[PDB]
Write a sequence for this structure.
């Protein structure tokens, strides 16, 4: 069956959390749960390929981050929904579900959120799996060695022009999101079975603005890091696995070299066949790395 | 308006190298001055200065290859850079029978004028720039917050840019209004020509043709950003630089890099202009041009 099929027994809740409402998908039961954190341009359904493979082995919890999927959006553009906000939202969600500790899977935005959860609410996090693991140490590597050509969207998406132009029609929305799903993948047809599900998601009122809010919230921090003034922080102590997509064109696999600087106990490996979306492009291998690390 | 048709304005399609250029001309004798537009422009960006200078100079205002009413290629290209524009202008000066000319440029036109001054120095008597980007800008393209200004240079290289901006007249208007307002200090300076500007960028090929510049210049830009530009010989011709003080994309502080690249440069600033000195402050721009070339 499809990597994007939905097994019976998937459950959806709207959970009141902090001063917002989050959509949370859950499947499975028994054992320490695994909290899966999506990126941009994604939502909880990014986890369907791994949920199809693992739901009989783990209780999987896949929220829409604030401002994504079917979670609540703010009426107006915001600059205060950064990694610490998402972390605090995840700590409150675990508290709403009666859970004292979980495994945490992160990539992209979800990797920033997972790092901030591990520092700010260390007791809630048993261990960490990252499918890419950007750190404060990246710095000038965001804009040097050709990388300036990959980062244009981070600035563009802070403009009024971005919501106006990308939001013109379903067709403009499809052109924009197809570019990221194709160019950021090594396996370019990886998202084809759920492509129209992604476009339906980014046509939902607020989902352009809510995702672009991440880029507004990170802008000051990214600019400081680019100019060699990174945000100081303590190493993450929890056992960590990094399984980086070797062909990731936006979060370069070479940035794995910065992981030991920020983690006491990180094991680093590469998915040789994936770009940015290891959990969609190489789900069998991704499921095996998850099952092994969380065993 | 500053965009009225000046007396003496003539239009030709001229065969140069492997292409055909639209060339607007005023006069045939006295001091010739070649005007080189930028992105997102075409020959008509020169109408304000032509309306002030039509009795004083032989003005030559081409559409560069892939702009305005000049020929476009059918598919996206990356070989239409500064050197290609310079060699086209060298061949256009031969077709008009002009042994040597003053040259005016900004933005794309500035890079093309530099490349013409270097590659065919016998054809260039003197140079006026309304902004004068050099390989020395280097890391200043992306440091100190400047990365937020240059997103368009990378976006415009993707097939996505042509498909999205080209969706409709409304998407085209929205995109080009962003640049004309955000890059300007005098925010209304293009309003009289706005409908004609959108007509231009709705012409088949004019999105792709202008976007080819960004594909063609990317390798040089990436080398400059990492502090490894190709060294070049200094430009020996007398040079005038009149840079818009408020230019948010080509920072006026980058005037600091001019003396490294030019033997003889007179550098001043237009206090009331952003990126488009020749449109936002045309009385002042025409006075600087007339004094330098007169």
């Amino acid at each position: 069956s499809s990597d994007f099929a939905t097994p019976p027994g998937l459950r959806h809740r709207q959970i009141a959390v902090r001063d917002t409402t989050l959509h949370v998908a859950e499947i499975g039961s028994g054992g320490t749960p695994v909290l899966l954190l999506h990126g941009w341009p994604e939502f909880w359904a990014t986890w369907l390929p791994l949920m199809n493979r693992l739901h009989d082995q783990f209780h999987l919890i896949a929220p829409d981050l604030r401002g994504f999927g079917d979670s609540e959006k703010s009426a107006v553009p915001r600059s205060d929904v950064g990694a610490n906000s998402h972390a605090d939202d995840m700590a409150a969600l675990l508290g709403a579900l009666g859970l004292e500790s979980v495994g945490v899977v992160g990539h992209d935005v979800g990797a920033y959120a997972a790092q901030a959860l591990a520092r700010r609410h260390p007791q809630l996090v048993d261990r960490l799996l990252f499918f890419n693991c950007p750190t404060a140490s990246v710095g000038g590597a965001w804009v040097h060695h050709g990388h300036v050509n990959e980062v244009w969207y981070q600035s563009f998406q802070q403009l009024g022009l971005a919501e106006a132009l990308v939001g013109t029609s379903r067709e403009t929305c499809a052109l924009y999101f197809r570019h990221f799903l194709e160019h950021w993948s090594h396996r370019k047809d990886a998202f084809e079975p759920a492509f129209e599900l992604w476009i339906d998601n980014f046509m939902k009122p607020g989902n352009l603005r809510g995702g672009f809010d991440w880029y507004r919230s990170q802008n000051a921090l990214r600019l400081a890091a680019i100019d060699g003034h990174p945000t100081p922080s303590v190493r993450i102590h929890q056992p960590t696995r990094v399984h980086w997509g070797r062909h990731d064109p936006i979060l370069k696999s070479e940035w794995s070299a910065f992981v030991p600087e920020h983690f006491d106990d990180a094991r680093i490996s590469f998915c040789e066949s994936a770009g940015h979306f290891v959990h969609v492009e190489a789900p069998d291998e991704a499921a095996d790395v998850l099952a092994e690390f969380f065993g």
